[PDB]
Amino acid sequence: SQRADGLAAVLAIGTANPPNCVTQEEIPDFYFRVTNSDHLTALKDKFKRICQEMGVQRRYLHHTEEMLSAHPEFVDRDAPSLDARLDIAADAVPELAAEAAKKAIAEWGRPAADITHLVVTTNSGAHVPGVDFRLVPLLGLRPSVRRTMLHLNGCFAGCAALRLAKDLAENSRGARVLVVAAELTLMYFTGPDEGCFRTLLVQGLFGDGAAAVIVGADADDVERPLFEIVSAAQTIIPESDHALNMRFTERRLDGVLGRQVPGLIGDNVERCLLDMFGPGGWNDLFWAVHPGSSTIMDQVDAALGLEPGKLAASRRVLSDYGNMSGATVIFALDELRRQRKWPELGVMMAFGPGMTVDAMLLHATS
Amino acid sequence: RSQRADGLAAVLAIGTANPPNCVTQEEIPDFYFRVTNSDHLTALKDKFKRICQEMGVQRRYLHHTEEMLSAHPEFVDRDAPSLDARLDIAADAVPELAAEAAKKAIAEWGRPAADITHLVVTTNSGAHVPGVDFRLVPLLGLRPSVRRTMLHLNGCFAGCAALRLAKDLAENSRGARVLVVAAELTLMYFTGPDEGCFRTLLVQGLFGDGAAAVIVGADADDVERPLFEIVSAAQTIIPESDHALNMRFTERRLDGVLGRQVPGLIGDNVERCLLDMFGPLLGGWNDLFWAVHPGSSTIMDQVDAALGLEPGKLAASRRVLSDYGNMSGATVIFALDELRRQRKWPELGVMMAFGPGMTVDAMLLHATS
Numbered sequence: 001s002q003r004a005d006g007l008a009a010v011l012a013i014g015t016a017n018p019p020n021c022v023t024q025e026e027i028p029d030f031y032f033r034v035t036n037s038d039h040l041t042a043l044k045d046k047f048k049r050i051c052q053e054m055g056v057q058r059r060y061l062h063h064t065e066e067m068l069s070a071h072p073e074f075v076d077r078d079a080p081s082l083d084a085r086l087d088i089a090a091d092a093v094p095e096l097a098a099e100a101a102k103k104a105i106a107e108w109g110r111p112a113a114d115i116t117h118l119v120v121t122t123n124s125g126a127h128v129p130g131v132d133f134r135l136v137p138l139l140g141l142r143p144s145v146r147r148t149m150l151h152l153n154g155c156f157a158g159c160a161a162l163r164l165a166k167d168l169a170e171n172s173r174g175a176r177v178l179v180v181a182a183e184l185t186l187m188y189f190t191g192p193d194e195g196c197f198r199t200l201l202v203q204g205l206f207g208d209g210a211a212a213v214i215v216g217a218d219a220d221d222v223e224r225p226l227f228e229i230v231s232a233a234q235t236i237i238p239e240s241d242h243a244l245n246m247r248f249t250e251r252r253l254d255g256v257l258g259r260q261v262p263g264l265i266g267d268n269v270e271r272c273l274l275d276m277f278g279p280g281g282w283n284d285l286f287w288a289v290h291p292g293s294s295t296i297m298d299q300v301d302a303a304l305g306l307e308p309g310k311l312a313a314s315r316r317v318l319s320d321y322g323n324m325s326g327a328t329v330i331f332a333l334d335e336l337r338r339q340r341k342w343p344e345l346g347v348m349m350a351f352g353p354g355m356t357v358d359a360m361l362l363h364a365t366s
Numbered sequence: 367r368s369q370r371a372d373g374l375a376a377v378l379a380i381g382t383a384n385p386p387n388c389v390t391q392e393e394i395p396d397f398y399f400r401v402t403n404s405d406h407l408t409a410l411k412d413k414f415k416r417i418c419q420e421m422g423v424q425r426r427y428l429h430h431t432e433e434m435l436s437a438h439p440e441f442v443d444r445d446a447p448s449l450d451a452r453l454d455i456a457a458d459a460v461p462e463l464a465a466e467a468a469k470k471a472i473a474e475w476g477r478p479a480a481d482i483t484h485l486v487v488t489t490n491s492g493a494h495v496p497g498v499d500f501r502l503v504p505l506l507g508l509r510p511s512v513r514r515t516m517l518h519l520n521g522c523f524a525g526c527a528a529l530r531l532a533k534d535l536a537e538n539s540r541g542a543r544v545l546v547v548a549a550e551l552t553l554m555y556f557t558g559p560d561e562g563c564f565r566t567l568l569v570q571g572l573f574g575d576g577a578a579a580v581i582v583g584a585d586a587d588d589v590e591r592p593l594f595e596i597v598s599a600a601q602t603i604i605p606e607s608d609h610a611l612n613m614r615f616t617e618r619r620l621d622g623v624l625g626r627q628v629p630g631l632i633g634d635n636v637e638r639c640l641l642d643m644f645g646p647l648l649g650g651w652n653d654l655f656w657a658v659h660p661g662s663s664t665i666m667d668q669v670d671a672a673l674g675l676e677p678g679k680l681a682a683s684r685r686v687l688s689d690y691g692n693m694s695g696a697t698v699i700f701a702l703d704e705l706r707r708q709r710k711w712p713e714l715g716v717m718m719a720f721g722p723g724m725t726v727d728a729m730l731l732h733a734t735s
Contacts, residue, residue: 001597001598001647002369003537004368006367007367008719009651079446080617082449082615082616082617082618083616083617086615086616087615090614091384117442122494125521126493126518126519126614127612127613127614127617128490128519128520128521128612128613128614128622128721128722129608129722129723129725130519130520132609133723133725135721136546136603143602143603143605143642144601144602144603145601146530146599146601147527147601148517148526148531149517149519149520150516150517150518150525151493151517151518151519152493152494152495152497152516152517152518153495153497153516153518154495159654160514160515162537163513164515164531166538167534167535167537167538167539168534168540170367170534171368171370171534171536171537171538176519222693231368232513233513234511234512234514235510235511236503236515238501238510241496241500244495245494245495245496246494246495247453247457247493247494247495248449248453248493248615249449249450250447250448250449250450251451254479255495275510275511276511287661325589338428352495353495353496353500354496354500355495356500356514
């Protein structure tokens with residue numbers, strides 16, 4: 001065979017979201033209505049204070065009032081419903097992912113058929129053939145496109161997905177990689193419980209979306225390289241696997257959102273980056289970071305002493321779409337170039353269970 | 367751009383492992399209807415008895431024991447939620463079994479777990495974050511900055527898919543050493559017998575547990591012994607066949623479908639597949655060596671007839687189906703390991719596996735000295 005010569009670069013970015021948009025102001029009433037609990041005035045009150053301090057202005061949801069009425073089991077906090085959840089996802093994800101993918105392909109400039117590798121990641125699924133497969137007919141990808149399917153990788157999925165693309169693009173001349181991350185929060189949706197804070201954090205922080213990226217090295221003259229992926233690394237924060245967990249259950253996609261999370265990223269981020277990239281302050285770089293929440297973003301700002309405008313793009317995404325798991329960071333990178341229209345080097349990173357920090361040192365181009 | 371490897375990624379070591387509880391095919395019929403309280407269904411047991419006798423498997427290894435089944439009455443109740451208990455058991459057993467296999471592989475390789483740069487793990491028996499890959503970190507003494515890839519639920523073609531990924535990880539970075547691990551615990555499918563559908567009996571007389579690990583890396587040290595260089599890794603789909611085979615998690619267990627059309631769809635299309643996949647790079651298939659996922663004996667026949675292979679070509683593969691049964695994504699790796707032992711001539715060979723899609727994931731290999 002033959003290989004590529006230069007660095008894998010991001011050639012295009014495409015995103016998409018469910019049509020149903022719920023503002024943050026209206027999330028409490030909506031939520032407490034479809035979950036039949038408007039009587040729990042106090043809990044609904046703790047949920048109002050919470051929401052106002054999350055950093056989100058609005059979210060997009062595939063699930064609606066009609067869909068939830070069609071499935072009272074999603075609300076019955078203690079009833080099996082994964083099947084119903086997976087059947088809706090089995091169709092909705094490929095749909096949403098294709099849309100975001102077409103958008104990326106449109107900016108890129110070449111036909112879906114020119115894609116040689118497909119890397120898909122999402123927590124909203126569990127099928128074989130998976131989304132990666134169903135995207136072939138939906139996009140018009142060649143049958144021999146080389147696929148990787150990543151089911152359930154959590155909040156650091158996008159970055160993790162982009163790490164494999166780099167090597168996929170760099171080790172084969174002409175190789176072109178479509179990376180797709182998509183998330184559907186109906187996987188976690190359930191009624192509230194007087195003592196379960198995680199259900200409210202989720203309900204007021206997560207949102208639906210899919211993000212797409214075309215990666216390739218030795219870009220044509222027709223292609224417009226936006227970012228070069230200099231290095232792609234990952235590391236773990238010591239003894240913190242009990243702060244973030246996710247797992248499929250009979251009832252839904254469950255887990256744990258420890259209060260220590262923000263403090264852990266805050267105390268370890270700088271160290272994590274230096275171990276990952278070691279080889280002139282952090283403000284000399286540009287940033288595209290998975291916005292866990294505003295607190296999390298405040299922890300990163302503090303630890304790195306970044307000027308407000310550095311994570312502006314990232315907070316903007318959290319604010320306009322909410323937390324969309326792995327796709328969030330790619331939305332972030334997108335928002336970063338929209339407004340760019342100065343530093344040449346930057347960091348694209350995301351945290352998730354582990355705790356795991358996945359990142360890439362990027363190089364901006366014309 | 368940083369330094370890349372010079373030559374092709376190569377298999378420097380292979381290690382396998384299986385749960386301690388071995389069950390022979392002759393024992394399967396009694397074991398199964400007993401623990402499923404269906405021992406009164408004398409007619410159905412006879413059906414499952416002859417089906418079992420022509421699968422091409424003489425014995426298997428199962429993590430689930432009768433004591434474990436008695437402790438989980440919910441497992442044999444086809445109409446009862448239990449994915450929770452199945453996953454809980456797997457969250458502990460898979461990484462423990464996967465460690466055993468990776469350790470044997472690291473032992474063969476000769477180098478320290480600390481020299482491992484990337485970790486790629488695949489398995490249908492898991493659904494957690496941190497997943498099996500993270501857990502192998504403390505269990506194997508791997509460096510924290512090791513670059514992980516967790517592939518949840520990829521089916522019977524996972525072994526090859528995982529290895530296809532490793533080729534690029536290893537080749538793109540000078541000094542890269544990839545640890546690939548595939549593991550399968552069939553308790554994820556375990557349930558009682560059924561009149562309406564015999565997918566259960568099929569799975570019950572064919573699948574077994576196992577885990578396999580491989581160290582992949584290019585530019586071998588003088589202390590390393592490259593076994594097979596991964597020349598090319600590709601993947602393709604067979605038309606209008608996604609209906610004959612599929613899997614998905616359900617509240618009751620890991621379910622799916624096994625169609626009768628599966629074996630015929632492979633015999634009718636393998637050659638087209640290999641051609642489209644490796645076309646240019648490659649007077650008959652009987653000149654290559656073969657490591658093939660062994661769905662069943664019938665599937666082995668189909669490949670033999672379609673490619674025109676003599677009985678010896680797929681012996682290593684049939685040998686694995688016989689000694690272990692179908693262990694999903696890990697099977698094709700046991701086969702390569704078996705081939706390696708049944709060779710202690712063709713320099714080029716094909717490592718191939720099939721799965722839902724239908725998908726054909728294979729690599730063109732080069733046997734070294």
